[PDB]
Amino acid sequence: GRSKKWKEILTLPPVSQCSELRHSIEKDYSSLCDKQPIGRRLFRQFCDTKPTLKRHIEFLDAVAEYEVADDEDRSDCGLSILDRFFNDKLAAPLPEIPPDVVTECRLGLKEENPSKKAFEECTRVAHNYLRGEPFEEYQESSYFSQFLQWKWLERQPVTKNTFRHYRVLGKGGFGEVCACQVRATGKMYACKKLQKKRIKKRKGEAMALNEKRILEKVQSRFVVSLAYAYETKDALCLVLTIMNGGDLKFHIYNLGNPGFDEQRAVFYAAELCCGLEDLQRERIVYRDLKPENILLDDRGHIRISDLGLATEIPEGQRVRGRVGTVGYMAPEVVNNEKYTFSPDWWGLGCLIYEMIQGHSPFKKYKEKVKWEEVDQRIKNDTEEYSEKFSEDAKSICRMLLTKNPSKRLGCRGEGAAGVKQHPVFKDINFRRLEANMLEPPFCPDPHAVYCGIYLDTADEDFYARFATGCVSIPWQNEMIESGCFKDINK
């Protein structure tokens, strides 16, 4: 757990030392009161002291509950929100909400199929009020000062000594990945060591900078999260989300028939859908969807890992290239065409197939085939199914494995939002899944195992471009989750 001197490591500075930070920090309401976890907790603590503001937060928490409610419980939530916050026989808790908006809610909640978006305008108007005088007043409170103290701690130096380095978990191209624990909080992570000599030999400079950047831009429950970055004399280290449930390749082959029950594949595909949507919201194309790249956690939840090939596509632009893994590349990828997010939707089709069948759609397990031929199979050969796949599972795979990207499921403008509407995900509540409220079908088994160069000045010019050390939101979450925020804030 926590170290003996944890309170000395995580000691808040005096408020006077936070003066530079106070004036320099951009006074953005969405960031400081919502997106930054400590900021959100402290603004809510401030609201708790003002009765009118406390009701606004309760209303937002009630709307969040409604948004994640089960279909047979949604109308009860909605009616409850109306009774508690818009009781006409009582005064107005939320006066700034226009009567026409209140009225529209009452009408949308009469309908037997109520829109999970029924309170969005009420929500938007509530935040408009909060980002005004309440936000101004919060900035002049003791709670904001406390937020600035945490913000100061957050920018404190990060070195190998911030962690305890345990057993090697795996071996990569640029080095090894080992299990590490933050000394101050006891939080466990995966420390991916990228050896400087290995980066130089394999020309992985642009790659390393890219992964780093991609991992910090993405804020997803289904994508491996970067919490820290540091440098040693030998390596550039990435401190990532620990996934000790093994990769999907291990579960399909080493523990599989090969393959596993449809219900699992469907659950994993649902999560992969959300991960892809999270990446696509950031205009990122993953490029290397394969079982070996999907990892499982202790709870049985998955995350996309290996973001080396992932690339951000600016608006009004396309990428090209035959990149990825032989057998997983989309027709446009093997044809070296100009494309955007289409390869990922194809990749999902490959994954669902491999999970159910027990081999990739255009390459058998172990199969000794030249790359040159696997590419022709991707371009021309069709994929044969079995009664391992339900009629719905055969449909999502057929739609995702369509050769022409413009006719492919998820590439016709509907995006992940559309892919989610497929009849395979009938039994799945995506709002609950996206909120970590759905239990996985399977859970990994505890105890059980699941798995000449000389540095010069041009290398120094590459290390200068590498920033250290902590990642803001993941760090603030670690502070809250570990109990350190509670035991210091009190």
Place this chain on the structure above:
Amino acid sequence: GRSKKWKEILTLPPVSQCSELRHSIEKDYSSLCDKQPIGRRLFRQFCDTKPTLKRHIEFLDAVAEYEVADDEDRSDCGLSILDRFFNDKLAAPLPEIPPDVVTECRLGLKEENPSKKAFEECTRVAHNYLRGEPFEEYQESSYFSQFLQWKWLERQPVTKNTFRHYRVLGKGGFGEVCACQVRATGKMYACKKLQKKRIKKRKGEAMALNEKRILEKVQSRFVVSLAYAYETKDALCLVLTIMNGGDLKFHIYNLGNPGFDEQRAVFYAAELCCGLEDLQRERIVYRDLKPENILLDDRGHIRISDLGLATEIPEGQRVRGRVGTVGYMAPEVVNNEKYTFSPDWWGLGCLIYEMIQGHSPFKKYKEKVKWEEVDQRIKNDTEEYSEKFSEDAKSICRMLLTKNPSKRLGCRGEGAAGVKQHPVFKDINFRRLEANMLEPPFCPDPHAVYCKDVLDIEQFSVVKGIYLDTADEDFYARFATGCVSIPWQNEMIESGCFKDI
């Protein structure tokens, strides 16, 4: 210089080929109705169809004129707004603005020297209104369907055939920089050709990928803008803002005393402040501030160029390294300490000094000094001034050339806002500078020479032992091609192509 068949090149698709776009476009008001120039023009066109919506636009535009108003004109400008939008109880054009917001506005406008932010809460409420039902209604309009058509044109292929290639402008480190023109619009750009063989030999893959990204991320009148990106069998090409007026090194030395008047230098330093503010709000540290890296345009406005060394710093993180040019590196840099944006404020100090004096602060012109000794001067020696400097110029240099970054001007929690507040800038109205309403003291003369030439030929270099393999293709895959949205949309409007379609 529009194409003959320009209307054929810029043909809008039917609103069926845009059905895809309509469902995949994130409905963000700030992006679709403000940041994106064509989205902004089309939502404003939709607003003209509704008198209440038309009034909100009139108000936002009136507040925008208030903000850029000269110090004497401002009070009467403010009063006219009050007179047009808040003086009638039964005929209120903006009813959703609470009377308490209007009360605070009238208070701060009653006094002499009113805040240029007097209508900032009024503006916030007007946008909250527009971001609601008017925005939802806009999404079902014919005006929004046109936006989807323009967005489809923007995603259309870009190659070497999109441009007319003109004269070579200069010799870059990775290839030729030449004057090029978009065929369909006739707009002139500078096409930086980065040779595939030169990038390989120099190991500039990370650098090229980073430069591209930074140029698309920054939206500044004071930073060279990337408008397009395309690929050739032998090069990666960046289509950039054409800067005919030459660089600052040429103006300081070649046609300078060495140096030029304080009045010019101060205008450049003010424009540089804006550029550095723009880079910092995108969390970027430029790192290579030096005269040759600041270019002039045909009107006499400057822009920070060569964003090769520029680094984006994630929040709560720091960079290190002794990088940049010898004589221009800050103490934290020479000592290889961990830092953020401090080297850029030191850099502004080095620039102001050189422009006024005629040589860098710790190295005389063309002096043969060992880099190690140059570093020692940067760390210990204090820069000497002359009578070429007014009292306020010496003040800005001494504060920007503070050895300890924690004591340096711009680095103490005040940023660019605090630097802009320095007495040297008393004669500059920053709101007008940022809005491009200030005329520069110096304007380049056409027919006059502003750079070293450069024969209008070649591209040729040392390419022996260089072979493009699989690893190179793995890098080209990462380089996206096409246009850069905001630059592209501005170009469509400026060229009149949007107006004539």
